[PDB]
GROMACS .gro file of N, CA, C and O in nm:
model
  484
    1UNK      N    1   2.148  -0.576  -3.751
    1UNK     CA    2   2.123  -0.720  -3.769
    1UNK      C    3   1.984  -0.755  -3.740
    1UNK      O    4   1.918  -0.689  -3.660
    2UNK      N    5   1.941  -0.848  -3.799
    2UNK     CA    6   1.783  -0.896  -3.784
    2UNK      C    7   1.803  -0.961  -3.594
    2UNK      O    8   1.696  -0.968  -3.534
    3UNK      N    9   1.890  -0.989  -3.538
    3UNK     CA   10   1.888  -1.068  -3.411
    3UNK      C   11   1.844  -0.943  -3.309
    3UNK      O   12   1.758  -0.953  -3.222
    4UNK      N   13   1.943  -0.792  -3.346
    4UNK     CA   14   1.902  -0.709  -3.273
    4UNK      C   15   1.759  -0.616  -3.280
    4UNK      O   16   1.696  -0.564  -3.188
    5UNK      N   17   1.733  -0.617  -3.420
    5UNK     CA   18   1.556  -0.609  -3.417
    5UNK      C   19   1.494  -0.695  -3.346
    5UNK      O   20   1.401  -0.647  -3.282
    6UNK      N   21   1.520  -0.854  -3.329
    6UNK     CA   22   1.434  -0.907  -3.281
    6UNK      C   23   1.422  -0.864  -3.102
    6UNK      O   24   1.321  -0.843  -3.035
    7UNK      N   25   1.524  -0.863  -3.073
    7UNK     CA   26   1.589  -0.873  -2.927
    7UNK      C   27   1.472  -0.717  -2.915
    7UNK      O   28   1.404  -0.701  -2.814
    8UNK      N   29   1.465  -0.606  -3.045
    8UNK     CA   30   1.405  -0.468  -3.011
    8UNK      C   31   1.298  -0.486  -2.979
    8UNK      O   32   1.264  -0.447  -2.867
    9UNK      N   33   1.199  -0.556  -3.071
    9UNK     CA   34   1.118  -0.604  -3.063
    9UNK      C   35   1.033  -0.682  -2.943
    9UNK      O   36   0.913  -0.670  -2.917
   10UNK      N   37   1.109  -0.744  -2.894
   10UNK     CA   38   1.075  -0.833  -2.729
   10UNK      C   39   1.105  -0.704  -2.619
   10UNK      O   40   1.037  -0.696  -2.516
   11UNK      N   41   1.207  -0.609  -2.648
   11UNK     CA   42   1.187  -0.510  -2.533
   11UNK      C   43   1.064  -0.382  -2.560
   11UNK      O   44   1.037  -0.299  -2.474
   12UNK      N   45   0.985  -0.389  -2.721
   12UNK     CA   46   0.877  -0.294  -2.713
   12UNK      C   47   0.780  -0.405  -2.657
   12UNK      O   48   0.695  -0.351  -2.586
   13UNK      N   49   0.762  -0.556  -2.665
   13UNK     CA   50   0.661  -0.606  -2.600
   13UNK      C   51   0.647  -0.637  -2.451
   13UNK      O   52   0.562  -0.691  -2.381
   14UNK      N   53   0.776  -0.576  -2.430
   14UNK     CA   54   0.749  -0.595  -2.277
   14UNK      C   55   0.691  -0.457  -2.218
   14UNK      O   56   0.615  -0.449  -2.122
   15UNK      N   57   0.736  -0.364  -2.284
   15UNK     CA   58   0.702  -0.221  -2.267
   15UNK      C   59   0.546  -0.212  -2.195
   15UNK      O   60   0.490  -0.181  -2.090
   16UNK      N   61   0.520  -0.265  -2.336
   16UNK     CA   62   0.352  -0.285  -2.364
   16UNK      C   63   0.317  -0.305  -2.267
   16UNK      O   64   0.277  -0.224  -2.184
   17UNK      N   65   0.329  -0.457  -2.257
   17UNK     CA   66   0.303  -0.508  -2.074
   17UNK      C   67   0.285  -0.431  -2.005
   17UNK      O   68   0.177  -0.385  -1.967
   18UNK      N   69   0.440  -0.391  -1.961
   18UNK     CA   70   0.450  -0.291  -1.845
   18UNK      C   71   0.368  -0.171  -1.800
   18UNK      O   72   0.337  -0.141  -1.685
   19UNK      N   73   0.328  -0.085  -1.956
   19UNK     CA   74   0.239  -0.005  -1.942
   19UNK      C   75   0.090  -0.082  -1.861
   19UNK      O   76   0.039  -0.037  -1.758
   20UNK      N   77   0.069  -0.134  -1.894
   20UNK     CA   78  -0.026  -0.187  -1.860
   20UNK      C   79  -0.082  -0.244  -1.730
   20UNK      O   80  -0.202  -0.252  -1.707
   21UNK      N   81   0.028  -0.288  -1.635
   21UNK     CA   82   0.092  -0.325  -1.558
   21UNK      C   83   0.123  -0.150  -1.450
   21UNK      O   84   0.100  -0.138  -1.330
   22UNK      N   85   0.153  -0.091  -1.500
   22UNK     CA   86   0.158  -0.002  -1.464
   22UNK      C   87   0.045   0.082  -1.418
   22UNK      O   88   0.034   0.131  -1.306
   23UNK      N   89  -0.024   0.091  -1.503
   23UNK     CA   90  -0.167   0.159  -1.537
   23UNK      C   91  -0.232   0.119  -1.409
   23UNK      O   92  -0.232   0.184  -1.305
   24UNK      N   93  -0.314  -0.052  -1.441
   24UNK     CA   94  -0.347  -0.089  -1.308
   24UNK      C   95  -0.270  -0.089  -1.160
   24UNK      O   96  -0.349  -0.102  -1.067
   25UNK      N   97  -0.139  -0.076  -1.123
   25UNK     CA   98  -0.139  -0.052  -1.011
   25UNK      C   99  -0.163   0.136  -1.004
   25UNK      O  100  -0.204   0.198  -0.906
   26UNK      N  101  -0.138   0.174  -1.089
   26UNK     CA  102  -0.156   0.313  -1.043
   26UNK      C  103  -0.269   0.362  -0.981
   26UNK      O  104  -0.280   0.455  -0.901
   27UNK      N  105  -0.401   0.243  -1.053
   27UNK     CA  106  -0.530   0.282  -1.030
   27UNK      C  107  -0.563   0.244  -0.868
   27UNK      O  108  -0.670   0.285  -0.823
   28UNK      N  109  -0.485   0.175  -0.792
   28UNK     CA  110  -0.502   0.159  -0.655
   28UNK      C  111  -0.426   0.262  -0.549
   28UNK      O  112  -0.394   0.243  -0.432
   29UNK      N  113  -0.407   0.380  -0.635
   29UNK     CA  114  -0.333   0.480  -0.530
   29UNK      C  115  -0.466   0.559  -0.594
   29UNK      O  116  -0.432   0.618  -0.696
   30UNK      N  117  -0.638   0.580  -0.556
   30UNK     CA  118  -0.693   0.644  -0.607
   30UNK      C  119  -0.680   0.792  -0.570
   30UNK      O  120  -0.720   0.883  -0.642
   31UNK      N  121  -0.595   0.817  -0.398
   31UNK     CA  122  -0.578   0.955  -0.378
   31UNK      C  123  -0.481   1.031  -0.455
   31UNK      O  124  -0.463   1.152  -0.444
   32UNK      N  125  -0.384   0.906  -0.580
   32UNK     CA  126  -0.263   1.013  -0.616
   32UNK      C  127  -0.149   1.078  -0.521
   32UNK      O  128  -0.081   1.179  -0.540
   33UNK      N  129  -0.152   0.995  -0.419
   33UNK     CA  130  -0.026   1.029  -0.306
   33UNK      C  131   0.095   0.996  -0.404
   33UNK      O  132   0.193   1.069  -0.385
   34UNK      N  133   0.111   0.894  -0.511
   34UNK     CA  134   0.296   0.870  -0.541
   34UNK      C  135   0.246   0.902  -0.672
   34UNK      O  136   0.328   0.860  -0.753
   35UNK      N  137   0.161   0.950  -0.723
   35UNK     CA  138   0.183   1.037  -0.898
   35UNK      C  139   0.343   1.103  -0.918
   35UNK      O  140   0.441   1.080  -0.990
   36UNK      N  141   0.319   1.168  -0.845
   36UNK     CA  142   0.437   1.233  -0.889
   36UNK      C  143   0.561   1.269  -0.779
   36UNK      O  144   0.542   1.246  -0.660
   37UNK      N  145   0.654   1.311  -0.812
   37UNK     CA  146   0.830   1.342  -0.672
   37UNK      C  147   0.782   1.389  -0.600
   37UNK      O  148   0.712   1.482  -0.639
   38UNK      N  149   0.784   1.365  -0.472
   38UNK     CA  150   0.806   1.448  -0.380
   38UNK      C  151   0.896   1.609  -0.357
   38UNK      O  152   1.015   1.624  -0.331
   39UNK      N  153   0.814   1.688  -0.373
   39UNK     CA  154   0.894   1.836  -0.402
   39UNK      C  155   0.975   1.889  -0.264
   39UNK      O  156   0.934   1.922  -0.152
   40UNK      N  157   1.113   1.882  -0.326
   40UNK     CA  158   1.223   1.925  -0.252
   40UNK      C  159   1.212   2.091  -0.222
   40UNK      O  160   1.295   2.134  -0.141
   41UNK      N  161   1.149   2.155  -0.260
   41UNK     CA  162   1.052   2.266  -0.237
   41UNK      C  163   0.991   2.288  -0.120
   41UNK      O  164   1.005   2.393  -0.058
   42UNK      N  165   0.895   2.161  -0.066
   42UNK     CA  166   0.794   2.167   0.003
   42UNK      C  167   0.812   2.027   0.111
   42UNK      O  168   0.744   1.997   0.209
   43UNK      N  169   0.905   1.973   0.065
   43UNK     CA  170   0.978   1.852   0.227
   43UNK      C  171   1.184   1.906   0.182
   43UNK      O  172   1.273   1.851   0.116
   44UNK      N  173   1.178   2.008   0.246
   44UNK     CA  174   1.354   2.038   0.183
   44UNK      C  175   1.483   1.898   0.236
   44UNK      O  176   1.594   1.870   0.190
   45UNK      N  177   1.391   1.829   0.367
   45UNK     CA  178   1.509   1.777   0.409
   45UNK      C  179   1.498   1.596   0.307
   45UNK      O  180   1.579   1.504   0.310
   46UNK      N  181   1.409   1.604   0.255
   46UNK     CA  182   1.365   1.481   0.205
   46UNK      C  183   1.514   1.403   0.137
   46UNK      O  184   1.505   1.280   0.144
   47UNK      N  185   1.605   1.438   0.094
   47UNK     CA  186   1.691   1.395   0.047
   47UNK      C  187   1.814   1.303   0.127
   47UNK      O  188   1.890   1.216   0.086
   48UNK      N  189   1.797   1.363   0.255
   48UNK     CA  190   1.881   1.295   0.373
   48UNK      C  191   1.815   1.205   0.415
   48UNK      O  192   1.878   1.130   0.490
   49UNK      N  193   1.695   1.177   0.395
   49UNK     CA  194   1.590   1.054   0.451
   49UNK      C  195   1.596   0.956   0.371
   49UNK      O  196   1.609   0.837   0.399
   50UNK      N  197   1.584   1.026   0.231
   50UNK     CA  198   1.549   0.886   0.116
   50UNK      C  199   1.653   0.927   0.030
   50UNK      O  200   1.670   1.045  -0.001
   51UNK      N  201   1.749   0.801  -0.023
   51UNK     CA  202   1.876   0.834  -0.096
   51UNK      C  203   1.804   0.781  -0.236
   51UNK      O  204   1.882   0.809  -0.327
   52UNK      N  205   1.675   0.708  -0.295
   52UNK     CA  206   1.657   0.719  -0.368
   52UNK      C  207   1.464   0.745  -0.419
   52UNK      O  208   1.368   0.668  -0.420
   53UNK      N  209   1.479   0.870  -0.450
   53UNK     CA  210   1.322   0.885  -0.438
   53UNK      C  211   1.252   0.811  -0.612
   53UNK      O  212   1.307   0.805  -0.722
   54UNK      N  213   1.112   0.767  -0.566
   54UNK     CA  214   1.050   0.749  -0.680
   54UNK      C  215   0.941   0.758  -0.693
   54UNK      O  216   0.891   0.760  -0.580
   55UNK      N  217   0.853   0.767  -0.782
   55UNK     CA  218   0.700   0.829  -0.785
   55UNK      C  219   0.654   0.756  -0.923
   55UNK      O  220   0.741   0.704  -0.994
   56UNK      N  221   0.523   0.751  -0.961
   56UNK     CA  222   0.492   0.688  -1.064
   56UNK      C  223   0.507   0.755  -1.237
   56UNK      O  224   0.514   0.687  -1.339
   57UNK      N  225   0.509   0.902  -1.226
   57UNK     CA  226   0.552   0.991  -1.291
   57UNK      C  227   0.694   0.915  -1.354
   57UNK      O  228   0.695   0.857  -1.463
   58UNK      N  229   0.797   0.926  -1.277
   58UNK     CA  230   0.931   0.888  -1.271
   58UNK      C  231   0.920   0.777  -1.358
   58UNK      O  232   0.932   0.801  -1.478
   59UNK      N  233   0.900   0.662  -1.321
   59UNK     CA  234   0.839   0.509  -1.340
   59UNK      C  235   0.825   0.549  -1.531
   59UNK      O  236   0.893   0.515  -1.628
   60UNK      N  237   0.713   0.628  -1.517
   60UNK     CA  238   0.654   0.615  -1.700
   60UNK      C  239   0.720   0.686  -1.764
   60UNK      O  240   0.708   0.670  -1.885
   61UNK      N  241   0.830   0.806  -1.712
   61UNK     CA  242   0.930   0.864  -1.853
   61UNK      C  243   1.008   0.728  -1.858
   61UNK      O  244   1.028   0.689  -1.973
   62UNK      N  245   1.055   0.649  -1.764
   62UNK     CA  246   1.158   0.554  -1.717
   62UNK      C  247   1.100   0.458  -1.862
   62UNK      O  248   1.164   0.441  -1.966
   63UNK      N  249   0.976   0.411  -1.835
   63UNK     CA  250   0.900   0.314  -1.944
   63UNK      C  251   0.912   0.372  -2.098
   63UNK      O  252   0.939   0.326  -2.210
   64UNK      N  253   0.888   0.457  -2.060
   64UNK     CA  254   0.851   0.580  -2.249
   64UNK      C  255   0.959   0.567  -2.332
   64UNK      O  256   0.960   0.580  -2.454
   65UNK      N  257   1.057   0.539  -2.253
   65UNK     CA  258   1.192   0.543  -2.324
   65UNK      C  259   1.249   0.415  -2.320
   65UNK      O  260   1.371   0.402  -2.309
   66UNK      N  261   1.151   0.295  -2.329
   66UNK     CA  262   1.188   0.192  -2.322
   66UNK      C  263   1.302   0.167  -2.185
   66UNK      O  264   1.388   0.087  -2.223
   67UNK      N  265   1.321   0.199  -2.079
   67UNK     CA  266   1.408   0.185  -2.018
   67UNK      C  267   1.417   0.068  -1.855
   67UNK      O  268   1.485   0.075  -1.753
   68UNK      N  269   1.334  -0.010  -1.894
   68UNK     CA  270   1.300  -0.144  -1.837
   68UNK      C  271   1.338  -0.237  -1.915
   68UNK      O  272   1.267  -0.252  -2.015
   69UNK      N  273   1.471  -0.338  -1.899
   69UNK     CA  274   1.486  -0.401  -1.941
   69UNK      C  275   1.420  -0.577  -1.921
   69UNK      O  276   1.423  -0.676  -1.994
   70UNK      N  277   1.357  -0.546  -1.766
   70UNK     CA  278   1.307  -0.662  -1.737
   70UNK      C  279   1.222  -0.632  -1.638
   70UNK      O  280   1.217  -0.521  -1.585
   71UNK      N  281   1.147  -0.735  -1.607
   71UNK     CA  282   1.023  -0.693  -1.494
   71UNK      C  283   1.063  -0.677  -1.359
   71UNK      O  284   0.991  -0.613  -1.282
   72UNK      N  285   1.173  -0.729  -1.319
   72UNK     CA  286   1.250  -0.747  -1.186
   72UNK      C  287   1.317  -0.573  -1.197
   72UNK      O  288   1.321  -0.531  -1.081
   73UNK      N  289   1.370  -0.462  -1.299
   73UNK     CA  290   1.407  -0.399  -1.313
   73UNK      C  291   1.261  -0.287  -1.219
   73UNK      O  292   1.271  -0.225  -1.114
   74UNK      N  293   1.133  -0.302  -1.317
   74UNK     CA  294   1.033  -0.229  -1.313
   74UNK      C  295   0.972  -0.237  -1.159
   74UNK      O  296   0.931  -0.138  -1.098
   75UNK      N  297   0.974  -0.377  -1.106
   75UNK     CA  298   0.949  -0.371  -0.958
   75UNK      C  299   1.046  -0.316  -0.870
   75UNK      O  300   1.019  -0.225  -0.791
   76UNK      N  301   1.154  -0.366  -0.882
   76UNK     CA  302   1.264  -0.231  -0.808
   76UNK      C  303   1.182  -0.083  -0.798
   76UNK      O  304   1.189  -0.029  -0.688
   77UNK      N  305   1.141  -0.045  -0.855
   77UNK     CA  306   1.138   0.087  -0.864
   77UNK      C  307   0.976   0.115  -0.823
   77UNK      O  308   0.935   0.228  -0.800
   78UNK      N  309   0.903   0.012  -0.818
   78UNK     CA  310   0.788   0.045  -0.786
   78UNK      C  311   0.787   0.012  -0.605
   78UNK      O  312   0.718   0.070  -0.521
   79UNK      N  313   0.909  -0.123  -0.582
   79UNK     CA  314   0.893  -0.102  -0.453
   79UNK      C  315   1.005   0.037  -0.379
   79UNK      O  316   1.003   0.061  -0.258
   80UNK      N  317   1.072   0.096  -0.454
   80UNK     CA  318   1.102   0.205  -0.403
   80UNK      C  319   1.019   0.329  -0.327
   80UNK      O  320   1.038   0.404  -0.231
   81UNK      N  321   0.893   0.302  -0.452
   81UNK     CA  322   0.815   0.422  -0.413
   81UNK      C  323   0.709   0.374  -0.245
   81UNK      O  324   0.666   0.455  -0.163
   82UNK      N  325   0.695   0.238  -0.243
   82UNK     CA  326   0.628   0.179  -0.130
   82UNK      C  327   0.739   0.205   0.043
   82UNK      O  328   0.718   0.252   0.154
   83UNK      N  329   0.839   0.150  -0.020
   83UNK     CA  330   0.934   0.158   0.097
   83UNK      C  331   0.981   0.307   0.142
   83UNK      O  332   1.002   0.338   0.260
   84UNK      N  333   0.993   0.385   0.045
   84UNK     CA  334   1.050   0.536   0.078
   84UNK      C  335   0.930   0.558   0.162
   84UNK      O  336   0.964   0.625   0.259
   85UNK      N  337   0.775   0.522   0.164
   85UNK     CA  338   0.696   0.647   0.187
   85UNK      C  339   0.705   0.556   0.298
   85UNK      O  340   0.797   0.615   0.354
   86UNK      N  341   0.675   0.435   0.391
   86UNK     CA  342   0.710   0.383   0.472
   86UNK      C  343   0.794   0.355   0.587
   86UNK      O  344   0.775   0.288   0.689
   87UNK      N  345   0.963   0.475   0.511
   87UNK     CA  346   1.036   0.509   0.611
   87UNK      C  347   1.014   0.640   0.663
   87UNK      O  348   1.005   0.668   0.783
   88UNK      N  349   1.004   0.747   0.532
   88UNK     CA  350   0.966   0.858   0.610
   88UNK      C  351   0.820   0.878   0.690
   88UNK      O  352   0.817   0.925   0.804
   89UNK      N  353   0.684   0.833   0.610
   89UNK     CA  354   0.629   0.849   0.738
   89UNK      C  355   0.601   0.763   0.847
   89UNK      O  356   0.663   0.657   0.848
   90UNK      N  357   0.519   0.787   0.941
   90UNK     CA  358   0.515   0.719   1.054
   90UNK      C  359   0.362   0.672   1.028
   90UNK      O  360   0.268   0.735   0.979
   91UNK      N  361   0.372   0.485   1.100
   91UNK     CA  362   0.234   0.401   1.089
   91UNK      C  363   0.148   0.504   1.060
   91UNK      O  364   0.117   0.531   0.944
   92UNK      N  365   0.108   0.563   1.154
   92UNK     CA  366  -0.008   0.669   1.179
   92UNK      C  367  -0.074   0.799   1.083
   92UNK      O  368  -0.139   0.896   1.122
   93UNK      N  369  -0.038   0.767   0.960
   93UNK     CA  370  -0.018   0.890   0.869
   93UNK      C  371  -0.115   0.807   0.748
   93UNK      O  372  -0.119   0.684   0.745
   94UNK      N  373  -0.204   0.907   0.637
   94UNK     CA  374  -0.277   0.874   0.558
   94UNK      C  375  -0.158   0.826   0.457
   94UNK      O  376  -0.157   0.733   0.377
   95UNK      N  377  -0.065   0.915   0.489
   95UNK     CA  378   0.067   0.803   0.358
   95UNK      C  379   0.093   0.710   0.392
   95UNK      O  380   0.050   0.625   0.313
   96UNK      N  381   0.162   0.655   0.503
   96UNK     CA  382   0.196   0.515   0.521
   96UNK      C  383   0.080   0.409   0.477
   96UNK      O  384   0.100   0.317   0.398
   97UNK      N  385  -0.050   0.438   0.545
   97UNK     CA  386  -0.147   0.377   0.546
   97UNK      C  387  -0.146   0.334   0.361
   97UNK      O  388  -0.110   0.220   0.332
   98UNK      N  389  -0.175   0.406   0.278
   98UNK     CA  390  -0.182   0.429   0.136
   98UNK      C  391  -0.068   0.341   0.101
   98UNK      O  392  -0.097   0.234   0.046
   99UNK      N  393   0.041   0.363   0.119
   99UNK     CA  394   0.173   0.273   0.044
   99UNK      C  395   0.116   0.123   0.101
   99UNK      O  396   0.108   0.041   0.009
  100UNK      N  397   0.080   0.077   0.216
  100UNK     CA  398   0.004  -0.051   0.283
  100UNK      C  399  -0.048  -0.140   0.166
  100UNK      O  400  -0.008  -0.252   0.132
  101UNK      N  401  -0.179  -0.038   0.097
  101UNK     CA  402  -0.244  -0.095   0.057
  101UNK      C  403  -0.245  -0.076  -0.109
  101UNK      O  404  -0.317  -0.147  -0.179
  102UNK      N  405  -0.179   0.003  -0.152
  102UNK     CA  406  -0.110  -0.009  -0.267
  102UNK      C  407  -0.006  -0.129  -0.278
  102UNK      O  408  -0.023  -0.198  -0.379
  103UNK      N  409   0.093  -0.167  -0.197
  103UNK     CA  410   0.148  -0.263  -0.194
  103UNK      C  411   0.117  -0.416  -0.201
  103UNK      O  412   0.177  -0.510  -0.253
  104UNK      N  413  -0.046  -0.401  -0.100
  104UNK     CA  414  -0.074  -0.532  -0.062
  104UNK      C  415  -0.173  -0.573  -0.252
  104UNK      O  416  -0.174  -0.676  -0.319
  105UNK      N  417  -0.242  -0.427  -0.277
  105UNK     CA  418  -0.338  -0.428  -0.392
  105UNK      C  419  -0.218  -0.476  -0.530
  105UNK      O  420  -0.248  -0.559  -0.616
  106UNK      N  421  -0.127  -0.425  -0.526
  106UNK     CA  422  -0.051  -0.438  -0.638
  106UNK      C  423   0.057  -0.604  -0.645
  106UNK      O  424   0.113  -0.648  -0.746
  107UNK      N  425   0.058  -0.657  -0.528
  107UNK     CA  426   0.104  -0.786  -0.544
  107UNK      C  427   0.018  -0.865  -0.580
  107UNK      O  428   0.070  -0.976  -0.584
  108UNK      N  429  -0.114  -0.871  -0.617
  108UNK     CA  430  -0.212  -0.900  -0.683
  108UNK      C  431  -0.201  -0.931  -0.869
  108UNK      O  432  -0.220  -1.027  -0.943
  109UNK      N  433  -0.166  -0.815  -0.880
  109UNK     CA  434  -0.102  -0.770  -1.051
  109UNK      C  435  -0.013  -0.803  -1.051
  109UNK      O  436  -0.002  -0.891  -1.137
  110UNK      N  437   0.082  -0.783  -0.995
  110UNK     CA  438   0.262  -0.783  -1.015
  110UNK      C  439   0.290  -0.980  -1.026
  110UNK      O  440   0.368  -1.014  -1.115
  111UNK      N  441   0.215  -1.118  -0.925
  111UNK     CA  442   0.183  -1.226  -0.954
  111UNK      C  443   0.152  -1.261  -1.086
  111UNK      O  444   0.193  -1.366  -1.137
  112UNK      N  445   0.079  -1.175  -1.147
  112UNK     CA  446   0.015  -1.215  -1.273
  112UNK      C  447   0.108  -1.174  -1.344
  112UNK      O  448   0.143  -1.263  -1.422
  113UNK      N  449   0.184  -1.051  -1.359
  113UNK     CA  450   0.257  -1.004  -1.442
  113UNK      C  451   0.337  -1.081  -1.467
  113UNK      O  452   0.337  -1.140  -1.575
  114UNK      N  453   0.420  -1.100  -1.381
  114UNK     CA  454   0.548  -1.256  -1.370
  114UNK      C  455   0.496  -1.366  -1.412
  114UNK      O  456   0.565  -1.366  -1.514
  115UNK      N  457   0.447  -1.441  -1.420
  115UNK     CA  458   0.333  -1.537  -1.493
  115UNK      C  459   0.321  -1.494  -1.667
  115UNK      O  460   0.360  -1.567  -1.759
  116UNK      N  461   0.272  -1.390  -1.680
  116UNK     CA  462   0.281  -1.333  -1.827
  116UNK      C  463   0.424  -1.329  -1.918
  116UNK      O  464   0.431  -1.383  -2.028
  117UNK      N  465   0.514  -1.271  -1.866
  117UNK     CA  466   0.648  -1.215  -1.880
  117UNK      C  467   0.744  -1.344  -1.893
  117UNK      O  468   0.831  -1.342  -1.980
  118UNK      N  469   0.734  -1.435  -1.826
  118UNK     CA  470   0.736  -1.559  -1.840
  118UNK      C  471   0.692  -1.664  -1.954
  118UNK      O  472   0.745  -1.732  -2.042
  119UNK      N  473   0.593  -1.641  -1.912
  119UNK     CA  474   0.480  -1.723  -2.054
  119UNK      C  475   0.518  -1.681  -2.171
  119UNK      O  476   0.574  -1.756  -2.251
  120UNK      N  477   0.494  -1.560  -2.195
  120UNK     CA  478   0.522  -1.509  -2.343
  120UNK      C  479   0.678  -1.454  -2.356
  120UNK      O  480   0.715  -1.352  -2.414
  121UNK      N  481   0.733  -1.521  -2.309
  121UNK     CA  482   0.903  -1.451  -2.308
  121UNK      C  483   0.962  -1.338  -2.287
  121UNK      O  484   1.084  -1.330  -2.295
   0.00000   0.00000   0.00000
């Protein structure tokens, strides 16, 4: 039906967004601490700590495949990756510190985003 193209259509323009949206907060983790999972390899117990892990990697197959249906969907998952690194490490650690200010840098964007997403439907 032409209603469900359209409806397709509003979820590739949000995509768009999102990429974008994405992009810039990524650029405030300049060390690359949440690029990518945490390897169950190299923290084995990580799974009993955090029942749901996420990384920015994760985030963009999640996007690629259109699989954000809304912006409230896409922040879920970005504050996953802030809060996980926050429980496992402790204040005192170059990670905690990093999720801090990724968090504080990215509510900056994420304001505007909601504003956009809004505006343009």
């Amino acid at each position: 039906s032409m209603e469900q193209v359209a409806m397709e259509l509003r979820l590739t323009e949000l995509t768009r967004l999102l990429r974008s949206v994405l992009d810039q907060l990524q650029d405030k983790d300049p060390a690359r601490i949440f690029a990518q999972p945490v390897s169950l390899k190299e923290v084995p117990d990580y799974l009993d700590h955090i029942k749901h892990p996420m990384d920015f990697a994760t985030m963009r197959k999640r996007l690629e495949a259109q699989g954000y249906k809304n912006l409230h969907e896409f922040e879920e998952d970005f504050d996953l990756i802030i809060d996980n690194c926050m429980k496992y490490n402790a204040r005192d650690t170059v990670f905690y510190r990093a999720a801090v200010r990724l968090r504080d840098q990215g509510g900056v964007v994420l304001r505007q985003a909601r504003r956009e997403v809004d505006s343009i439907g």
